[PDB]
Design a binder for these strands. Sequence first.
RNA 1: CAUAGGGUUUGGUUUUUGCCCAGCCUUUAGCUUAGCGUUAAGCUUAUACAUGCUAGCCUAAAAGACGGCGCACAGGUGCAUAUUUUGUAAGCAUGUAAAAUA
RNA 2: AAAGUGUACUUUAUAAAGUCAUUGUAUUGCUUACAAAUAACUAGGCAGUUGGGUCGGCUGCUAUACUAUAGCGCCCCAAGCCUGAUAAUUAGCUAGGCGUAACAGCGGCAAGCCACAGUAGCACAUAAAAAUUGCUACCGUUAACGCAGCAGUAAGAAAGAUUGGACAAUAGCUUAAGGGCAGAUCCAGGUAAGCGCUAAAAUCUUUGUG
RNA 3: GAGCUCCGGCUAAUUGUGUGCCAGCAGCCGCGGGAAUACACAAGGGGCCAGUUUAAGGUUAAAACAAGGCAACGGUGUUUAAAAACUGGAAAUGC
Lengths: 123, 123, 55, 114, 130
Amino acid sequence: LTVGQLLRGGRTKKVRRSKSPALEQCPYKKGICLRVYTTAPKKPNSANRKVCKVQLSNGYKVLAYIPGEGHNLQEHSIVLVRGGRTKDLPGVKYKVIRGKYDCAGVKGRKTSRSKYGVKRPKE
Amino acid sequence: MNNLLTQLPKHDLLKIKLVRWGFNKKPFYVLSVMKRRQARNSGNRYEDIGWWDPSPHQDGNSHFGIKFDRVKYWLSQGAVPTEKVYGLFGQAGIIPQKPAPPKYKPADGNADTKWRPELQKNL
Amino acid sequence: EVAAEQAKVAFAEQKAAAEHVRRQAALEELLRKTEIECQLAMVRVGRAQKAEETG
Amino acid sequence: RGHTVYHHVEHHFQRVKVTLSPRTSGWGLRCSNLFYELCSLAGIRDLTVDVSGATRNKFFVAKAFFDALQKQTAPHDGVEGTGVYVKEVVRRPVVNLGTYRNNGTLPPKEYLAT
Amino acid sequence: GGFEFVGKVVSNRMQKGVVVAVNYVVWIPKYKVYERRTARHMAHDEGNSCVIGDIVRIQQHRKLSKNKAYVVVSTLKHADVYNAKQAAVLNTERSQNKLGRVEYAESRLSEVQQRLLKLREMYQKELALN
RNA sequence: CAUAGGGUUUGGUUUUUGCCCAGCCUUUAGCUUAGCGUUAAGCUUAUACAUGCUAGCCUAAAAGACGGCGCACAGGUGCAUAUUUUGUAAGCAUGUAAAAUA
RNA sequence: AAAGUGUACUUUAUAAAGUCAUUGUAUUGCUUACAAAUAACUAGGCAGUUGGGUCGGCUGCUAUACUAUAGCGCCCCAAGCCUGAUAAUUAGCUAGGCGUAACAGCGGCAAGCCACAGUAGCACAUAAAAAUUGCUACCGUUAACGCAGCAGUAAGAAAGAUUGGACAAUAGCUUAAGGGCAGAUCCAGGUAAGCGCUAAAAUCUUUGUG
RNA sequence: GAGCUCCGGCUAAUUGUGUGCCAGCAGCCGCGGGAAUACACAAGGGGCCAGUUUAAGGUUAAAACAAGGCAACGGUGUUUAAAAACUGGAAAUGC
Ligand SMILES: [K+]
Ligand SMILES: [K+]
Ligand SMILES: [K+]
Ligand SMILES: [K+]
Ligand SMILES: [K+]
Ligand SMILES: [K+]
Ligand SMILES: [Mg+2]
Ligand SMILES: [Mg+2]
Ligand SMILES: [Mg+2]
Ligand SMILES: [Mg+2]
Ligand SMILES: [Mg+2]
Ligand SMILES: [Mg+2]
Ligand SMILES: [Mg+2]
Ligand SMILES: [Mg+2]
Ligand SMILES: [Mg+2]
Ligand SMILES: [Mg+2]
Ligand SMILES: [Mg+2]
Ligand SMILES: [Mg+2]
Ligand SMILES: [Mg+2]
Ligand SMILES: [Mg+2]
């Protein structure tokens, strides 16, 4: 650009979007489950992945993926949600933290217990 | 940033005061020319003139530094030292010692422990 | 006050020197340009005499 | 002196740009891993190297580095035709004003004179 | 700042008033350039005879009105004003007589020579002063 | 006190553009956690508030403030404010004027 | 003026002093210029609006400057003034501070300035002043109150500490009889920024025994 | 010594058993269809350490004033043109 072009607002700073807009620049958000069901992934994968529809405390509704093997989530259950995207599931951009208010940890887990909300066995 | 004041107060007095600049139970003081009615550690000053370390060192003495020329300048203008500053100037020989009034109240029997609950817990 | 008075006198002396330098430079440039104009004028006179013969 | 370059060097191999900056003895090497290995072989000990452009092909990157080193000039090139004595001198290099301000330090007194 | 300015007269429609234009520059740290800007100032004119297009000098003064806080001190250049009567006289002189190709050229050469001769004398005097 | 890159686009190569990762600084969540000394600190609500406390001292025209001095100091927050403000620079008449010392 | 003055007040076989009242060469100051985010899918804006004249603009008590901020207000007169103007969106500002070779970018700590105290209009309060001063209307609870003072409670939120001790020190208010007041402040309690040290004994540390 | 996390490549660190495009993993490229160093568990090992690993913000990994393109895609249909910026030029007439 010329000097005149630069002076008259020639350059504009690039703007980048967030990956979890529903969190409103917060690490976590509380919500209540509306529906719990399973969905199939895109090609070339094949499975029945567990997902739930959650309404956040700010009124937004998002799809959340439930990690681990098995869960006890039903409709009208309080959960805590964080960022994180499941690549093979289209439209799912959030995950449920396990071990918190209503969700429990995976039974029998021995490795990476912190990521699945399992306490250290005292016995 | 901390530009020194130039105009003299019109409705208050100038004084030479001690400013607390120590640590927990490790006092250290700085002498400055400030308005009488202000916060203790306010940034409004006319000049910083000295420093004082009240605790003894390996040599068994306390250490005190002062600008001899500027102390006279401000005393002439009308700056009024506080009671403790009068003691420092009196001992240092800048001005004659100021007499104190007679005392009758029975002195305090608990002066170094009354205000320190940690000692009282052991007591 | 004494220093200020000397500075004012120094300023006046410096200004006078600067003006003389500029005046001489301007005269030198003007003299050169006028000489060029005179040379062109002499050339034009020769062409004017030549053109009159054609008419 | 067998440890750095004579002066700043900028070379343009096809779709690659390489820059070399001399440093004081003992300062160290600031460059990518590939150039670090190349400096060890040649014996270069103190230098700063920056490479940009189309660096996908590492053959060109190495070739560009090789050619840059060959564009230096030495004080003894044709010294017989100068009629003078080219003498090595000791002059500390300087940094920019911003570096002084951030570190809270001062430049050589020869420039601060006022 | 703002004690004195030199500018051009852009409005004389007020009683003992004038508006003067000023040019100045501002430093832009990010692009390392000087940006040219303009401003308008209203000044008090006691003479009340200024002409649009004049170059004048204004100086800081006590506030006189809502938007007037300057006074005109001096005029550096007077704007040209068309005068029909003078122009008509010049036209009559131009049409009074005509010269040929040679006569006009010779007259031009003589005039330049006289101007050059006087200029040389002035230059020598300046050198003598030096 | 002075400028470091790697991965990815499936005939190969070259070239252009996009995407992801490694540092430093700051808050929460999971799992886990003995003690002592000390530095810097309390990062969402100008949402609604039980209870206790934060500014009084002195004197007296008949034992009492009605009078004097303070509350114009401290402490809290950032609603409003694009300039009303903030950060700077500049301007503002005179020997300070009277009187026999005849 | 860290001063002078008094038909004034208080203390004294010991007296120097202070208290209260009053006093300053003009008797507590206004104005201008430059810089500081987006923004044209905001193009016209202004009529007390731009300029000129008379009058007003108080709180006296040196003399002149021909009246010595100002459309700040009334009346009259002339048509001018602005035009990236006008209208919107967002934000307390400066700065310490965090990243960066720098340039640039972003805005937790100590301090300075400005604004505010449930909302709004007013009276005092000018010159250094309204959280803990009044009047009126309104909003929310119940004629009253409004914790954005310290501690503390409820709701909301991913996430916000004890209903603690002391005036011993520093700063401040009052007081000539040497005292009084204080959630400023200094200390303690609570919360895995950071920094330092301990978590094993040894001739019972030869810096010993005698 | 004591916990948290990781061991296909980027990136320091492998063997066995179970599962069989199921259950599940995943920052990126991608793993699982009966012979899995990528899923779950056991053992062994790597990193950090009273801490450790996600998530969410500021900045860097040159958005280009130092310093990018219109030659992968972008210069607009053409000309005239009293703001601004930069800055002297070769014109008119007659058979
Ligand atoms: K699992
Ligand atoms: K808040
Ligand atoms: K009094
Ligand atoms: K208000
Ligand atoms: K482009
Ligand atoms: K077209
Ligand atoms: Mg795993
Ligand atoms: Mg590079
Ligand atoms: Mg770094
Ligand atoms: Mg009194
Ligand atoms: Mg705001
Ligand atoms: Mg109010
Ligand atoms: Mg106050
Ligand atoms: Mg409230
Ligand atoms: Mg509170
Ligand atoms: Mg005291
Ligand atoms: Mg933690
Ligand atoms: Mg390896
Ligand atoms: Mg892996
Ligand atoms: Mg595995």
